[PDB]
Design a protein around this ligand. Sequence first.
Ligand code: FAD
Ligand code: FAD
Ligand code: SO3
Ligand code: SO3
Lengths: 394, 394
Amino acid sequence: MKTQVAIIGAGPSGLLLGQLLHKAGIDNVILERQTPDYVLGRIRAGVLEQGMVDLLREAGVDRRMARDGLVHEGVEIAFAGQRRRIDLKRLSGGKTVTVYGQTEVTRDLMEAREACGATTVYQAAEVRLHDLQGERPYVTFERDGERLRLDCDYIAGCDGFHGISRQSIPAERLKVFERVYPFGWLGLLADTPPVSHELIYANHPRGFALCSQRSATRSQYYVQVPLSEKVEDWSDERFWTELKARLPSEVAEKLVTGPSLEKSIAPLRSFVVEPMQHGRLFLAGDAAHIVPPTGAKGLNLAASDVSTLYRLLLKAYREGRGELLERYSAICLRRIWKAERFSWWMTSVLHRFPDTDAFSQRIQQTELEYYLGSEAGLATIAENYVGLPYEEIE
Amino acid sequence: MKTQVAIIGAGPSGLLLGQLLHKAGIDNVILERQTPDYVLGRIRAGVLEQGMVDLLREAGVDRRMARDGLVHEGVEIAFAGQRRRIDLKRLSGGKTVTVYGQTEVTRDLMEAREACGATTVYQAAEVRLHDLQGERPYVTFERDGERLRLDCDYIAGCDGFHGISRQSIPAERLKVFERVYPFGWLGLLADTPPVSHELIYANHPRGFALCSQRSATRSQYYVQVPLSEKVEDWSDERFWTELKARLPSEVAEKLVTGPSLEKSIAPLRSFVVEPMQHGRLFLAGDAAHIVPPTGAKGLNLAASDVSTLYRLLLKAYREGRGELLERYSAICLRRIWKAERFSWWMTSVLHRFPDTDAFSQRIQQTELEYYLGSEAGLATIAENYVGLPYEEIE
Ligand SMILES: Cc1cc2nc3c(=O)[nH]c(=O)nc-3n(C[C@H](O)[C@H](O)[C@H](O)COP(=O)(O)OP(=O)(O)OC[C@H]3O[C@@H](n4cnc5c(N)ncnc54)[C@H](O)[C@@H]3O)c2cc1C
Ligand SMILES: Cc1cc2nc3c(=O)[nH]c(=O)nc-3n(C[C@H](O)[C@H](O)[C@H](O)COP(=O)(O)OP(=O)(O)OC[C@H]3O[C@@H](n4cnc5c(N)ncnc54)[C@H](O)[C@@H]3O)c2cc1C
Ligand SMILES: O=S([O-])[O-]
Ligand SMILES: O=S([O-])[O-]
């Protein structure tokens, strides 16, 4: 096979990059290790930044989102028995966020790519990258019992955290930054109407809780739990009782509960690699970084990494400004670090950390009080939550 | 589940460690991501050092090897149209090597573990390590549609180069050393009688070639080829013709050729991580290092890593000398580096490297001439080939 941009991974990052390149007339091929149904079987949430919403529209894959997505003009943080609303729209000047799951976005992108006949090779086993520092890099993989070669000009590693792309870069060139939080999130998805039209992030002595939604009849809730917790020890009844205990009475009081459609515990961690490229290989999305779910920035960083790569690739192909690609990592990292910082801040002020002393507890309560009670403070939250402005490049 | 030593990986390293611990009465459980047939489907060669042969006997899994294995008292290196024999037995004082494939060794270990009822969980998906720096580390994984927890005292990461164990150690604690050679090995396995009763490593202007064997009616041959070569462009006829062109006439002349049972190109690379442990987790085999096939040290290092870990675990459990486990990496690395060095030397003197000048070519020919023409030189080769003596520990 032969293309211009080889793409490893058919998750959100790879599909979005591929659809953007497709519309731009830049040849591209996506190689995915799993099957279509396997990828779609991954149930993942999503709170889309304005930048991502705009990118999906630019990619021509927004019809479903415009119909099934939930546009939120604000978000609330609860603590000390009170609900504090952050007016994202007002504070940002018009920006909002859209609650539409990664799973749905992935589904939409796959239907769009399948419809236009773009190239996607599923069940591409043993993917391997070659001659990355040359002008003719290529990829090899096995399919239907045969080895194939894919020649290209560039390679976009969009293969996630456990992909092969990040592992294909000499360890000497990379620097890893990481942190694991001392707790996980026990989530419960149910066919019940949400308790609020907007999300509710709750800080409570017993621990963090979050009220989210999927539709008028489907809701998603979470409560923080220690690392060693087993989902088996958490019946729906126990979850509902603990969730209510961490929410203001007025909220817990009007909460509609019911059987769970799915329950699971997920850890919270951060990870960033520098740089995010090597020769003709460029990493994007989870292949380069991880963030905790608190700020819902994972899916959004995948989008911003792709946007940047796409725009630089355009400059290379249409302006012969290929040297600009050298700036890919520096640009993405500035945004990734700010997202990691905001995600870290949100995690720090909303959760109960083990072995915390009285002073720390008071500092945390004061952080919430100050930020939610100041216009400047509220602004820092709002501008970060809807997503900081994309860097124009150059 | 609950055991004393949790083992990740049911390849040679994990199975051997597990069988050794089984006989010692130390509880152990092996978690393997793939199925039994998948593991056995990996066709891998093997030239066993005396130390490994002794270890398999100690493990009580040597009957098949004693019957089907080929004991070699010497090995030959050909160059400049002449065959030079290295009398391993004489030079080492009695040590030899046994040609018996990794695949056969793995098969033997699996039959032995299955027979004694030791615990092995195949298709163990999403393996994850936990609380490595505590006194109660544990592992989690999914099976038959359910999440399970395995408590233990120690964890042996025997999950290979692309395993999760090495990736479970903070990047800040690790230092990676690596090298990729500018060529690969095109191998051809056939049901033909070998051209020699001992191996023949050949250095020739056109490139490296190797004559090996599996039995009186089965042979394995290799010729070096550039990185970008496709096995598809190499018919059996072309392989046989190139192989002969790289061997002394007397050898090429008596070579029996025939249809290949299997053909493939494999790269040559080296990789070492320091340290090889973190808390209660200890890496062994490919999970910690890779060596080129030239010295056939890959399988042997897996064995020596296991031997060391096993002996240290014994000291911990039977002598309460658990502090000795702290020395695991230092001990293994001394042997790993010497094996990497010898493997590197063998690779350097036997292959044709791209863009080599006249001086390099002459230095290489002189290396062979000196080492094969000196008793001290021959000794350095012999002692390394049969395997240096295992470090006694402490
Ligand atoms: C339990 C959990 C909950 C999360 N919740 C949130 C949330 O609430 N909000 C949010 O924004 N983010 C959340 N995230 C993060 C978010 O899902 C990711 O940031 C997003 O999946 C990144 O997309 P990606 O395409 O970069 O990577 P992925 O979605 O991982 O896609 C990568 C693709 O590459 C393929 N691949 C891997 N290796 C290879 C290979 N060798 N060859 C070929 N293909 C390969 C994979 O099969 C996969 O399809 C969560 C993550 C987890 C684990
Ligand atoms: C093409 C090729 C040719 C080679 N030729 C030679 C040769 O001629 N001579 C020589 O000595 N060596 C050779 N080697 C090297 C040799 O095969 C290895 O050194 C040996 O396989 C190492 O054994 P191991 O048990 O440490 O790892 P492996 O054999 O890789 O076994 C690791 C096991 O862990 C499992 N695993 C991986 N990830 C997970 C996870 N997340 N959870 C659970 N289980 C997991 C794997 O499925 C596997 O079964 C060759 C290698 C290759 C690739
Ligand atoms: O199921 S598929 O398209 O390989
Ligand atoms: O095929 S098995 O034993 O999981």
